[PDB]
Design a protein around this nucleic acid. Structure first.
Length: 260
RNA sequence: CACAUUGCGCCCGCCGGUAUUCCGGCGGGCAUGCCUGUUCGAGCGUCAUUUCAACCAUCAAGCCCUGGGCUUGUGUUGGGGACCCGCGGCUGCUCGCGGGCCCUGA
């Protein structure tokens, strides 16, 4: 790779995104819930990794976590749902009382598997939950049972797949619930929410969201370059031999080649 | 029960006479309509009965630079939208695998 031309790939895209959003709508009626700054801010950007062989033999519904120098979810209007195994009442008190105030506001709701498996069975119920929140996380004890309880409303879109977390301190839920020390859970949850995700789909194309169109091109370039180093070093088999074109994609724009 | 005669039935117990069987006597009870409840029933009066449940890993195994992190545990309803792509065939049009956006009651 190279930084300078990858960087020149960056502001080449945001320039096209900025002019696309600022362009007036031809039919003459504007959007009542869309500001030209807001639409640019909400527009994500993706890097599309192409290979010459499968990343995985089959679909992997537990995504991989790649830490970034600049975390992704930092907007104020981000609501997060946490899924647990122990009594959700315990985590509700844990959320309410012993918990930082900045990341309380980003918590939407916490629900155990039992309440998840009872209320959200119908497809509308899991679609209502799917649309209401932005990102989801679940304890590794339960992440295996989530595909059945959530259906294809979560594991076909592939965008809002839940993120695994480890509430392993080292049976009657009502007796006692093993739990990690609270101050380092909130470090883990903050770590998990801001970590980019890679979906080990069977195909030879993996798209990763590494920022938005309101980010500075240099900070976006730093985010993309560390994903490129990490992802090839850990996930794709055969490392550099299996890797191929690296396209930067806008959700409504074209692709920007970067050949490795 | 009987014009009521100090006569005669049925049930439980007792007493005195040779007494488990006989005799006599004594004590407690046995009318009708109706109400509340109890228990025992009757009815080709009506109904239900061949059970749509729960039941993956609410943690295990292996590791590393000894305490945090890592890997494996394959688990998804269907359909539609002159929308934006990656990769393979197709001389080509196009078709397949996988994505991003949107809609819909299992």
């Amino acid at each position: 790779v190279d930084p300078d031309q990858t960087l020149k790939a960056c502001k080449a895209l945001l320039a096209h995104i900025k002019k696309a959003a600022a362009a007036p709508r031809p039919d003459g009626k504007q959007n009542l819930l869309a500001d030209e700054e807001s639409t640019v801010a909400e527009t994500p950007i993706w890097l599309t990794l192409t290979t010459k062989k499968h990343i995985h033999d089959s679909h992997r519904l537990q995504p991989g976590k790649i830490i970034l120098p600049h975390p992704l979810n930092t907007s104020e209007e981000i609501s997060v749902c946490l899924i647990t195994a122990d009594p959700q009442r315990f985590y509700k008190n844990a959320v309410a009382d012993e918990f930082p105030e900045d990341l309380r506001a980003k918590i939407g709701r916490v629900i155990d598997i039992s309440h998840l498996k009872a209320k959200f069975k119908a497809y509308e119920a899991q679609r209502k939950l799917f649309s209401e929140h932005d990102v989801f996380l679940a304890d590794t004890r339960i992440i295996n049972r989530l595909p059945k309880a959530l259906g294809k409303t979560f594991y076909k879109t592939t965008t809002k797949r839940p993120i695994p977390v480890v509430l392993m301190a080292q049976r009657d839920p009502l007796e006692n619930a093993n739990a990690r020390p609270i101050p380092e859970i909130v470090a883990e949850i903050r770590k998990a929410i801001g970590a980019a995700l890679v979906h080990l789909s069977p195909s030879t194309n993996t798209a990763i969201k590494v920022g938005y169109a309101n980010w500075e091109p240099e900070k976006l370039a730093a985010n993309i370059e560390t994903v490129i180093r990490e992802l090839v070093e850990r996930f794709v088999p055969q490392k550099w031999q299996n890797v191929r074109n690296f396209y930067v994609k806008g959700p409504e724009t074209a692709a920007l080649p970067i050949y490795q």
